[PDB]
Design a binder for this molecule. Sequence first.
Ligand SMILES: [Cl-]
Length: 233
Amino acid sequence: NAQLDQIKARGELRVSTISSPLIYSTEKDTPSGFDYELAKRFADYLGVKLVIIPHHNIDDLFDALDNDDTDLLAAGLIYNRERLNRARTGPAYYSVSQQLVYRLGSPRPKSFSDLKGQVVVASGSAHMTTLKRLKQTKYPELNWSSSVDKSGKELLEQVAEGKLDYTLGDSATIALLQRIHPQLAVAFDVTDEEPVTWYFKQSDDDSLYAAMLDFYSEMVEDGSLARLEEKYL
Ligand SMILES: [Cl-]
């Protein structure tokens, strides 16, 4: 049978995520996050239980999606053309800018020419693509690396604790973490707004994908998706 039939027979919609106040947070009894809330409503729409699996590594998320270990990715993921070989994006929900973060009390960098330490980002993130682009063009001196086991949220926490000098994160996540870690500061903006979307496996089977688009249509219809977006942004 088709993808949706299998989901219905499992009685569960398997969604892979990353822990963050914007995506999926369990810092108290009731979980929260935009991706979590939208995924719950989607599971309800399909008539199945939601099964969330938070990961740390984006490359792993895409491998799971390709291996049918999960049904969709809902993890604050920025559009990345390299992911289209095996995956397809759902509709765009909101946009975020990429910002370079440093810790208050330490020197404020003025540009990528002025960094003292390394900038570390999450492996497979769109943040990584941006750094590669800049190093091959305007900043040959740029010292950067990728973290295989830390998320953008965990990387921001490291900057806050003084264990990492800088990270390149998204504007929405930075804003939320700042209310818990006021020592996090923006040195400068790096990119203009980029859209966030869910990802699904590319297949000739649209039993799930078409349902996702039907669900999205219903959500937009009375301005309900806008309200939800604005609540977390
Ligand atoms: Cl990303």
